[PDB]
Amino acid sequence: KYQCVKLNDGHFMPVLGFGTYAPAEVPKSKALEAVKLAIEAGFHHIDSAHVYNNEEQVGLAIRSKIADGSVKREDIFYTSKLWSNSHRPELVRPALERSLKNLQLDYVDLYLIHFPVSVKPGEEVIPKDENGKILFDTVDLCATWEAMEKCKDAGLAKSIGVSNFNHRLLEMILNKPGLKYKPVCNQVECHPYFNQRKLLDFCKSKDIVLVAYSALGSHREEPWVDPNSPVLLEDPVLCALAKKHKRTPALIALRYQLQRGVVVLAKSYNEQRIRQNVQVFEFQLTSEEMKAIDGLNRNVRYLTLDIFAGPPNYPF
Numbered sequence: 517k518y519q520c521v522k523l524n525d526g527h528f529m530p531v532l533g534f535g536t537y538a539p540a541e542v543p544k545s546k547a548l549e550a551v552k553l554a555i556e557a558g559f560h561h562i563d564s565a566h567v568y569n570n571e572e573q574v575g576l577a578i579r580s581k582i583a584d585g586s587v588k589r590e591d592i593f594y595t596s597k598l599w600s601n602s603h604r605p606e607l608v609r610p611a612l613e614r615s616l617k618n619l620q621l622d623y624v625d626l627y628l629i630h631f632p633v634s635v636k637p638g639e640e641v642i643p644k645d646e647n648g649k650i651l652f653d654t655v656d657l658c659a660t661w662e663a664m665e666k667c668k669d670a671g672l673a674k675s676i677g678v679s680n681f682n683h684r685l686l687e688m689i690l691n692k693p694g695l696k697y698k699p700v701c702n703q704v705e706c707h708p709y710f711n712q713r714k715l716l717d718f719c720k721s722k723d724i725v726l727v728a729y730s731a732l733g734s735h736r737e738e739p740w741v742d743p744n745s746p747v748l749l750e751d752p753v754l755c756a757l758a759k760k761h762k763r764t765p766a767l768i769a770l771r772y773q774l775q776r777g778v779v780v781l782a783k784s785y786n787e788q789r790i791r792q793n794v795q796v797f798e799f800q801l802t803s804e805e806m807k808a809i810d811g812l813n814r815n816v817r818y819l820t821l822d823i824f825a826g827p828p829n830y831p832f
């Protein structure tokens with residue numbers, strides 16, 4: 517058994533997820549070993565994406581653990597994400613099926629719209645013109661969403677959701693004439709320096725789960741993240757709470773999310789840290805400790821994704 521939350525479509529999501537993105541200088545081979553160690557440690561939820569360029573390795577890890585009798589397919593919750601070069605409705609299903617081929621899995625447990633700005637179709641994930649300009653595309657995300665719906669009805673994705681959506685863009689889906697399925701989640705950056713209270717409340721009001729990425733303060737990969745931003749895990753309050761509990765600042769940051777109702781992701785490719793992170797279910801924070809952490813909020817977004825700023829759907 518393991519801790520899950522009931523989604524708005526009746527499926528269940530494990531509340532701690534294993535993140536699989538690593539910077540390009542880390543070999544892809546490392547994704548295979550890390551996902552096997554995450555499964556061994558007790559992770560039951562594995563988050564990836566077409567754009568992570570690791571679905572071969574992550575799928576092999578999952579298939580290996582199923583084939584050797586370690587885990588059943590029903591006890592793995594695997595998320596993929598539709599990249600922005602495939603927002604056009606007729607391209608949605610092919611992108612899912614391409615991911616499933618790479619993974620050699622029959623279905624994903626969750627498919628997200630990765631990011632609300634569209635880019636021109638093609639193999640290139642950030643297509644550029646000869647002058648280095650990103651080739652943006654104009655697509656009705658409500659059409660993209662109907663396509664997602666169809667993937668769910670086809671059994672290819674057990675649940676569907678969104679990522680990097682703001683209030684306006686969520687409302688656009690929720691108010692769509694003819695909506696069949698609400699997004700089960702909105703996967704967004706969330707940690708004690710950017711705690712997303714407002715958006716979290718809104719998602720709650722709609723029974724949408726907020727899933728937190730960069731919950732440990734991100735990879736800090738240049739050029740995605742400003743190296744001058746504060747290092748989350750060096751925070752003196754998180755570090756004092758860690759000392760107090762004989763845990764670590766990471767565990768405090770993970771636990772904070774769980775207690776506020778957020779499903780939380782954590783990436784590590786390090787065996788010791790992978791095993792450490794599951795210890796989030798071994799302790800609890802008091803109401804005063806939670807308030808202390810709430811007080812750390814500083815409107816610091818690590819991942820602005822500002823190379824996609826300009827188009828109307830840019831969400832920040």
Ligand SMILES: NC(=O)c1ccc[n+]([C@@H]2O[C@H](COP(=O)([O-])OP(=O)(O)OC[C@H]3O[C@@H](n4cnc5c(N)ncnc54)[C@H](OP(=O)(O)O)[C@@H]3O)[C@@H](O)[C@H]2O)c1
Nearest residue numbers: 535536537729730731732733734735766782783784785786
């Ligand atoms: N939807 C989106 O747009 C989007 C965006 C960003 C991320 N994501 C997803 O969310 C996942 C996690 O976010 P993220 O990659 O930004 O990273 P993160 O989980 O915030 O942090 C990863 C970093 O923390 C380190 N770490 C992990 N456990 C630790 C611990 N116990 N003590 C100290 N350091 C620890 C990792 O190093 P080691 O590997 O060396 O332990 C890595 O440097 C990604 O992998 C991806 O699945 C989604």
Ligand SMILES: Cc1cccc(Nc2ccccc2C(=O)O)c1C
Nearest residue numbers: 537565567568630631641642680821
């Ligand atoms: C290398 C590469 C190419 C295209 C997209 C991404 N990453 C993202 C872009 C926008 C939104 C989210 C991500 C992500 O890493 O999840 C990366 C890392």
Ligand code: NA
Nearest residue numbers: 535537538783
């Ligand atoms: Na990561």
